[PDB]
A paper describes a structure:
MPER bnAbs show outstanding breadth, neutralizing up to >98% primary isolates, but have uncommon features. Notably, long heavy complementarity-determining region (CDR) H3 loops with aromatic residues at the tip facilitate bnAb binding to the hydrophobic MPER and nearby membrane. DNA sequencing revealed PGZL1 was from subclass IgG1, whereas most MPER bnAbs are IgG3s. Using X-ray crystallography and cryo-EM, we determined the orientation, angle of approach, and composition of the PGZL1-Env interaction.
We reverted the V-region of PGZL1 to the most homologous germline alleles, i.e., VH1-69*06, VK3-20*01, while leaving the CDR3s unchanged, thus creating PGZL1 gVmDmJ; in a second antibody PGZL1 gVgDgJ, putative reversions were also made to DH3-10*01 and JH3*01. The MPER671-683-bound (2.47 Å) and -unbound (2.6 Å) structures of inferred germline PGZL1 gVmDmJ notably differ in the conformation of their CDRs L1, L3, and H3. When superimposed, residues in CDRL3 in the unbound structure are shifted up to 6.8 Å from those in the bound complex. This shift of CDRL3 in the bound structure may arise from MPER binding, which cause a rearrangement in the aromatic interaction between Y32 (CDRL1) and Y91 (CDRL3). We note that Y32 has affinity matured in PGZL1 to alanine, which does not affect Y91’s orientation; thus, the CDRL3 and L1 conformations are similar in both unbound and bound PGZL1, and resemble the bound form of the inferred germline PGZL1 Fab. Using biolayer interferometry (BLI), PGZL1, PGZL1_gVmDmJ, and PGZL1_gVgDgJ bound with affinities (KD) ranging from 9.9 nM to 64.4 nM and 938 nM, respectively, mostly due to different off-rates. Hence, PGZL1 gVgDgJ binds to Env when detergent-extracted from membrane, but not on the cell surface, whereas PGZL1 gVmDmJ binds both solubilized and cell surface Env. Strikingly, PGZL1 gVmDmJ neutralized 12% of isolates at 50 μg/ml and 28% of viruses at 200 μg/ml in a dose-dependent manner.
Author numbering:
A (entry chain M): 5 to 64
B (entry chain L): 2 to 27, 27A, 28 to 213
C (entry chain H): 1 to 52, 52A, 53 to 82, 82A, 82B, 82C, 83 to 100, 100A, ...
Write the structure that this text describes.
């Protein structure tokens, strides 16, 4: 319906994944679960122009 | 018709002669019996058609024979690329059946596995599940038994395992087993052990760890 | 030359139906049977049915009479198979195979040409990117083992490499396992010298195209 992207900037886990949601809030809820499932804890940013969330752990 | 192949697994060394058998419950006309070769991840490949004719491009060390209910595929000198699964087939317009397949595997000396055990990572425990992984590396033959123990209590129904194909370099197998528990159940026990039985071990081997240490 | 190209992998909900296509190029598409043969994971070949396009007459295995329809389109030299009210036991690779021709006199009565296969997964699960967990080397005679646990993804497949493909010796990537959740799970391990754990970086590169997951997990020794 609209594809959103997650870029992961963790200490040991780096890369990207996507999801299909209607809302940015529905994608955020999918991405925050995924990031926790992979034990990533970091700072969240969002760019609506590109439908891209970013999570960045402190240091790397 | 029921086509029955034998043996189910055939363990031979390269250079040896392989004999594969396809037996039918009832008579099959010779021009309807075909043999196929299948390798992991690939489509089947026609070897023999009409019981005895080689398809285009099949080396002449493959031969087929038989009539009635007894058919045979012979490979006179096994080259390494010949180790695969083989299917006979009764070709038909209105009905067609396949044998259940013979796996032709490389025979080598007995090799005992190296056994490693891995506790669940810290990042997995953040998500409420705990996976314990036991690795059996480079053993032969393929038959191996893995028992999980949690505080010396035999586990059951909470593990899955899978085996690699036979390695092309050294002809061994590897096995991975995963024991799965909730995070809560994992925190309630201390000793996680994996006991391995195999032909190259004179007695079961146990690898283990204590949660926390 | 004769070539059978099949449509792509599909995930289907139970009870639905799927149509698989097989386009033939480089031979006559008329007087030679096109059959469909399926193979469930870890199991044998099972003939489903076939059609001679020029006659239009389709035959089916008893097992599938009533929910499979095999048709042929001579206008595009494409053969189709439709399988309805899918169940989990219909998860398999579906091959199209075409009878070969004789030298001058004909029918080979064997499948000379095969398609590359179509993976049909029948599941109520949704697309889910993998979680990648380290299998950390501990502190096996001078040899350490490490790896990655690629857990809870759907559908198949995932590909795993190590250090962007520069590490290949000692690597074992195991066939995925289907969990009671409906999600798949697999492990990739590598065997390395214990002495290298302090100086080499080991990164497993996990790719899951259905979720467009490309993800790199650094596996470090636990102290």
């Amino acid at each position: 319906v609209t594809t959103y992207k997650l870029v992961i900037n963790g200490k040991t886990l780096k890369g990207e994944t996507t999801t299909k949601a209607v809302d940015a809030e529905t994608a955020e809820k999918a991405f925050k679960q995924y990031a926790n499932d992979n034990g990533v804890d970091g700072v969240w940013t969002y760019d609506d122009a590109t439908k891209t969330f970013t999570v960045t752990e402190h240091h790397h | 018709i029921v086509l029955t192949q034998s043996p189910g697994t055939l363990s031979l060394s390269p250079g040896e002669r392989a004999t594969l058998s396809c037996r039918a419950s009832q008579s099959v006309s010779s021009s309807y019996l075909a043999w196929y070769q299948q390798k992991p991840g690939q489509a089947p490949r026609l070897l023999i058609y009409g019981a005895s004719s080689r398809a285009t491009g099949i080396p002449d060390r493959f031969s087929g024979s038989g009539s009635g209910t007894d058919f045979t595929l012979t490979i006179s000198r096994l080259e390494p690329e010949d180790f695969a699964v083989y299917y006979c087939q009764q070709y038909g317009t209105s009905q067609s059946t396949f044998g259940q397949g013979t796996r032709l595997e490389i025979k080598r000396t007995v090799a005992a596995p190296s056994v490693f055990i891995f506790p669940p990572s810290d990042e997995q425990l953040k998500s409420g599940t705990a996976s314990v992984v036991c690795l059996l590396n480079n053993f032969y033959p393929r038959e191996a038994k893995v028992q999980w123990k949690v505080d010396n209590a035999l586990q059951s129904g909470n593990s899955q395992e899978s085996v690699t194909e036979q390695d092309s370099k050294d002809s061994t197998y590897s096995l991975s087993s995963t024991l799965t528990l909730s995070k809560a159940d994992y925190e309630k026990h201390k000793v996680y052990a994996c006991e391995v039985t195999h032909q190259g071990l004179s007695s079961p081997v146990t690898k283990s760890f204590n949660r926390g240490e | 030359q004769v070539q059978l190209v099949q449509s792509g992998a599909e995930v289907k909900k139970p009870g639905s139906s799927v149509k698989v296509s097989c386009k033939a190029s480089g031979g006559t598409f008329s007087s030679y049977a096109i059959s469909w043969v399926r193979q469930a994971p870890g199991q044998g070949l099972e003939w489903m049915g076939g059609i001679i396009p020029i006659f239009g007459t389709a035959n089916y295995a008893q097992k599938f009479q009533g929910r499979v329809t095999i048709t042929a389109d001579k206008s595009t030299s494409t053969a189709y198979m439709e399988l309805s009210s899918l169940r989990s036991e219909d998860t398999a690779v579906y091959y199209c195979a075409r009878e070969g021709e004789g030298w001058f006199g004909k029918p080979l009565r064997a499948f000379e040409f095969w398609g590359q296969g179509t993976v049909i997964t029948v599941s109520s699960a949704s697309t889910k990117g993998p979680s990648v967990f380290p299998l950390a080397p501990s502190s096996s005679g001078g040899t350490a083992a490490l790896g990655c646990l690629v857990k809870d993804y759907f559908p198949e497949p995932v590909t795993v490499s190590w250090n962007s493909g520069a590490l290949t010796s000692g690597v074992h990537t195991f066939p995925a396992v289907l969990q009671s959740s409906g999600l798949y799970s697999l492990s990739s391990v590598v065997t390395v010298p214990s002495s290298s754990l302090g100086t080499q970086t080991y990164i497993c590169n996990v790719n899951h195209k259905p979720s467009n997951t490309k993800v790199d997990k650094k596996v470090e020794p636990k102290s």
